[PDB]
């Protein structure tokens, strides 16, 4: 059995989906049908520097991993189960038939516009400690508004909160063993119920959508589970507001008897994170 892993923000690169855009003209034009403006340019070009920035990332990495599993059906069987990284759910839903293309672009550029507007606290990319030593490490440093915000692999977690906090747990994580801390560049704490207002209005946003059931299971970023048909909505909406279960959603499937994880987007971030899983599973 196979898994398709969609990547998410982060994982954006100058140059992406150069022959994909060729490949795939008619998705090409219908993607700057919903954006007003040029994919491919965004994506190949990078103007001012747009691809870091989340309103136009989320977009970017939408198409490319749309794209990136096309091409896949075309010239492989199709995978047992699907998942993706935060904004890699948008791109597993479309690949299970959830949405249409321009559905799930739609989604991703008022996700894009919601996380870009949104204000307060802040992230930190952690490598090096489990779960529990970080738990362990905001425990004994008092940061009781900071939370674990992404579980990624056994020895990579994303923190989020008070800003403040966020920098003043650098050296302690460092001294503690952390092999790098790196404070994110991130409009607010996401992942927190901090975010719950843009939950709340991403909710009501897609009380205007009619969805269709998934053909193939995706395994939330909430639960670590396959999304239920009548769910999708707070698997989307609730995930702003809830810590990404990454690392668990991969055990589940190593655990359901999935051998097999190919990465379907552009780079190897998750192929990465699968290594790491593996060898500790
Ligand atoms: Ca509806």
């Not at 990495?61 to 749309?66: P, W």
Request: net charge neutral; proline share 5%; glycine share 10%.
């Amino acid at each position: 059995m196979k898994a398709y892993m969609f990547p998410g923000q982060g994982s954006q690169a100058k140059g992406m989906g150069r022959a994909l855009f060729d490949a795939f003209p008619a998705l090409t034009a219908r993607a700057d049908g919903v954006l007003g403006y040029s994919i491919r340019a965004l994506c190949q070009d990078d103007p001012d520097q747009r691809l870091s920035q989340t309103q136009f990332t989320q977009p970017a990495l939408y198409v490319v991993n749309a794209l990136s599993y096309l091409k896949r059906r075309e010239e492989e069987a199709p995978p047992d189960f699907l998942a993706g990284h935060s904004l890699g759910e948008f791109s597993a839903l479309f690949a299970a038939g959830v949405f249409d293309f321009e559905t799930g672009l739609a989604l991703v550029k008022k996700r894009g516009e919601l996380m870009g507007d949104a204000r307060g606290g802040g992230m930190a990319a952690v490598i090096g400690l489990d779960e529990e030593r970080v738990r362990e490490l905001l425990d004994q440093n008092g940061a009781t508004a900071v939370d674990i915000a992404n579980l990624n692999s056994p020895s990579q977690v994303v923190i989020s909160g008070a800003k403040d906090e966020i920098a003043r747990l650098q050296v302690p994580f460092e001294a503690a063993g952390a092999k790098k801390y790196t404070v994110l560049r991130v409009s607010a704490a996401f992942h927190s119920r901090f975010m719950r207002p843009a939950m709340v209005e991403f909710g009501r946003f897609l009380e205007g959508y009619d969805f269709a059931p998934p053909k193939i299971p995706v395994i939330s970023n909430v639960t670590a589970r396959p999304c239920k048909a009548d769910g999708i909505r707070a698997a989307l909406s609730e995930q702003i507001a809830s810590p990404v279960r990454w690392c668990e959603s991969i055990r589940y499937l190593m655990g359901r008897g999935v051998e097999e994880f190919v990465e379907c987007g552009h780079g190897i971030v998750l192929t990465g994170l699968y290594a790491q899983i593996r060898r500790d599973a």
